[PDB]
Design a binder for this molecule. Structure first.
Ligand code: 6OU
Ligand code: 6OU
Ligand code: Y01
Ligand code: Y01
Ligand code: Y01
Ligand code: A1AIA
Lengths: 417, 304
């Protein structure tokens, strides 16, 4: 095992000092990375120096501690954001909002720094591979728009506040990326992401049925109604909530034409109903029979069938992404985003080098491993039942012919004697 | 039972039983409640509330009693096992619920002092939406409009607020995720895990039967209410056998071992793989012998 670990990572002068892990990643060979040896090596790197001035340094520059510090900074920023949104804001921002804005601005600067680390188009193409980093940029742009709008006169400030309120949701949901590190959680997130296509295919049909029912209900009643714009809302509004247990029992089949004295009041004569008002309830049944009991159970069955395959694929993919996570957090500076401005002002390993004797030793070990592999492969092949049967049949055929030749020859001898 | 100088080892062994820890904790809470209940009025109701909260543990403790039944015990074990997956679901549901509640609270009530009600308001309404309550009254209130109503003078409502039409839309997406996406995933997880958990639970219960039986064999006859007399008085599994019976048992064991080895060898030698291997080897040897005779037979032709 130790020699395997050493072989997996060592500079190759012939191949541009690229270790086996880098080549496997470039080839996207998930099986190689998912192997136990590579996973153990990645875990060893994750713990950095601890693996359980110099005393401080080993703890400080380990990737795991940097990950924890970044996570804590993010959590604090999130807490401040919540406090800001809930409480009233004056004309000028408070200290908390200044801190939040500075954090966002520095994070955007750090994203630009990652972009730049004349090939810029290739760098952008590579960067687009990370889907999270696109939504992050979009959310930052929306936040900047909200900030610009919030500092104007009264008519715009509330719009800026609403922009903040809508934007907070993305940052609240971004915690899935942080959770990704956990063994159990990451695959769960991947499966959740995968199921959304089936969810959308269900949604289309549900939307069709809901539109039909809403249009029918709206048309049956309110005969003399001007177009306006409320009709489009009314179509979608009521039926959508019926999926979740609200049936509006008050206004299913109103009494309409009847005498309703009620109590503590004079008798009131209600309108004499309308033509074809008894068809709405019946329809309201069929819709509920379809949206609730038919499609949802089908979706459940689809999930059950897809679960196993999605689980396996997600596990392998997360084991593959571990390496990118580890290297990304190894490269990053120690100070969390709020204070990385100093690191950027200052701005303004994976592989271990080995001695010649060790290189020759590793080469010898590799050749020995190859020889053992081929010998074992041949031994397994020659012990297969099919090969043994084939050899037995061929040798039996040859023996039969030789036996016949001897028998015919033995016949000649009888005459000789 | 703890006492039946090794006391640390006894405690370490005792901690293995998870029920016996919660039992002690509940007893301590009950003692605290009893002490509080006998003071003046301001504390007596707090003691009563302590009793009311404590009763739940004793009501749920009946699962241990049910454990003896063949069917029930495995069910309890499976229920206990599924809670990890339940927790993993709960974390994500909590994240989504917090996001929705904070958004709803922030969109409305712009001029609101911090106080402490906000933390409640965030969690309160969204949690119940999972179970069929949508608060139809206060989804999209009419706000800015004329509402004469009846048996009353005309009342002019506030002119709504900016961005109040975004809350309903959000309220849809949340419901589309919490209710139809995560729950069905949890159902699928349960379906996949059921078989393995069932088998493991059956085996584990069959293992725990012995501990149950011995524990209740050792205990005194009188139930706990009257065990004080037994303790004041305080203040089998194996049968002994004769020598001849011991020798007989040893002979039977040796015979069983001999039969086991003989049957194992008989099964091994009748395998198809071994027969094919022997056939091939003997055929090869026969072929060589046939060739040797044939070459030798050629010599004889010259001899004749
Ligand atoms: C309402 C909430 C809606 C959606 C939240 C669910 C998040 C889905 C999680 C998807 C995770 C995922 O694996 O896809 C990732 C995409 O993540 C996303 O979907 C983020 C989009 C969330 C937008 C939410 C906007 C909220 C505002 C309204 C990319 O995967 P990768 O890391 O590039 O590599 C994976 C290799 N196949
Ligand atoms: C709300 C109700 C919450 C939980 C009730 C569900 C009870 C789960 C049953 C767990 C049974 C179980 O097997 O775990 C047992 C643990 O039992 C428990 O979880 C008891 C904890 C219940 C606390 C309830 C507190 C209620 C007050 C609020 C230990 O197993 P074992 O006998 O030591 O050996 C088993 C070998 N693996
Ligand atoms: C996972 C993260 C997002 C934590 C949850 C976010 C918010 C729900 C929490 C985080 C810190 C909390 C605050 C901590 C301190 C205070 C001040 C405190 O108000 C008072 O001091 C006045 C007391 C009174 O008059 O009653 C209570 C509310 C508030 C804003 C709390 C309300 C809810 C906050 C913003
Ligand atoms: C899919 C299956 C299982 C449905 C089971 C229940 C339905 C058959 C019930 C539920 C609600 C009922 C409706 C509730 C109210 C009315 C108004 C009622 O109108 C009248 O009879 C008076 C006017 C007239 O037609 O003369 C006609 C039946 C209808 C549609 C009822 C017919 C049967 C419905 C659709
Ligand atoms: C996930 C899919 C299947 C959702 C299906 C139904 C939704 C599209 C419906 C349900 C409730 C509807 C909302 C109910 C009320 C309103 C207020 C309405 O506000 C206005 O148009 C007046 C002010 C203005 O914007 O000019 C805008 C649409 C909205 C969010 C409706 C738009 C469509 C919604 C989200
Ligand atoms: C850009 C990624 C991240 C991050 C991601 C996972 C864990 C910790 C931090 C962030 O999104 N916000 C704070 N700084 C960061 O680099």
């Amino acid at each position: 095992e130790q020699l395997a670990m050493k072989l997996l990572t060592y500079e190759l002068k012939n191949w541009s000092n690229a270790t086996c892990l880098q080549l496997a990643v470039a080839a996207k060979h998930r099986d190689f990375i998912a192997h136990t040896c590579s996973q153990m090596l990645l875990t060893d790197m994750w713990m950095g120096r601890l693996r359980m001035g110099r005393k401080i340094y080993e703890f400080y520059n380990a990737p795991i501690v940097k990950f924890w510090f970044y996570t804590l900074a993010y959590i604090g920023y999130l807490m401040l954001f919540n406090y800001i949104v809930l409480v009233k804001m004056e004309r000028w921002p408070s200290t908390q909002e200044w801190i939040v804005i500075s954090y966002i601005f520095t994070l955007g600067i750090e994203k630009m720094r990652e972009i730049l680390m004349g090939k810029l188009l290739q760098k952008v193409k590579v960067w687009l591979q990370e889907y999270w980093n696109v939504t992050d940029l979009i959310a930052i742009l929306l936040f900047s728009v909200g900030m610009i709008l919030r500092l104007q006169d009264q008519p715009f400030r509330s719009d800026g506040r609403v922009i903040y309120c809508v934007n907070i949701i993305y940052w609240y949901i971004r915690l899935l990326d942080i959770f990704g590190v956990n063994k159990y959680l990451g695959p769960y997130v991947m499966m959740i992401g995968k199921m959304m296509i089936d969810m959308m295919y269900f949604v289309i049909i549900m939307l069709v049925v809901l539109m039909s029912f809403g249009v029918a209900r709206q048309a049956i009643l309110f005969p003399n109604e001007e177009p306006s714009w409320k009709l489009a809302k009314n179509i979608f509004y009521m039926p959508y909530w019926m999926i979740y247990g609200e049936v509006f029992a008050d206004q299913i089949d109103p009494p309409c034409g009847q005498n309703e004295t009620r109590e503590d009041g004079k008798t009131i004569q209600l309108p004499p109903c309308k033509t074809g008002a008894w068809i709405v309830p019946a329809i309201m049944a069929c819709y509920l029979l379809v949206a609730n009991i038919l499609l949802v159970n089908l979706l459940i069955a689809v999930f059950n069938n897809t679960f196993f395959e999605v689980k396996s694929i997600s596990n392998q993919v997360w084991k593959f992404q571990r390496y990118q996570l580890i290297m990304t957090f190894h490269e990053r500076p120690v100070l969390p985003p709020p204070l990385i401005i100093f690191s950027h002002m200052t701005m303004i390993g994976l592989k271990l080098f080995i001695t010649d004797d060790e290189l020759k030793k590793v080469h010898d070990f590799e050749e020995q491993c190859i020889e053992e592999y081929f010998r074992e492969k041949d031994d397994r092949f020659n012990s297969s039942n099919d090969e043994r049967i084939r050899v037995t049949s061929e040798r039996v055929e040859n023996m039969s012919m030789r036996l016949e030749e001897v028998n015919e020859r033995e016949h000649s001898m009888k005459a000789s004697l």
